[PDB]
């Protein structure tokens, strides 16, 4: 299981299309695909 270490509360959680269901912000227990972005902001393109 993957661990993303620490993110400041300054980063608002990503409200995303949220396939396998509705359109809403990220809550605990949600199901995430291989490419989905977890936080709101800018994603590293080396990562992608």
Curated annotation (Swiss-Prot):
Top-level taxon of origin: Bacteria
Induction summary: 6-fold repressed by starvation.
Family: Belongs to the RNA polymerase beta' chain family.
UniProt function note: DNA-dependent RNA polymerase catalyzes the transcription of DNA into RNA using the four ribonucleoside triphosphates as substrates.
Subunit composition and interactions: The RNAP catalytic core consists of 2 alpha, 1 beta, 1 beta' and 1 omega subunit. When a sigma factor is associated with the core the holoenzyme is formed, which can initiate transcription.
Name of the protein in question: DNA-directed RNA polymerase subunit beta'
Lineage of origin: Bacteria, Bacillati, Actinomycetota, Actinomycetes, Mycobacteriales
Coverage span on the entire protein: 1074 to 1121 of 1316
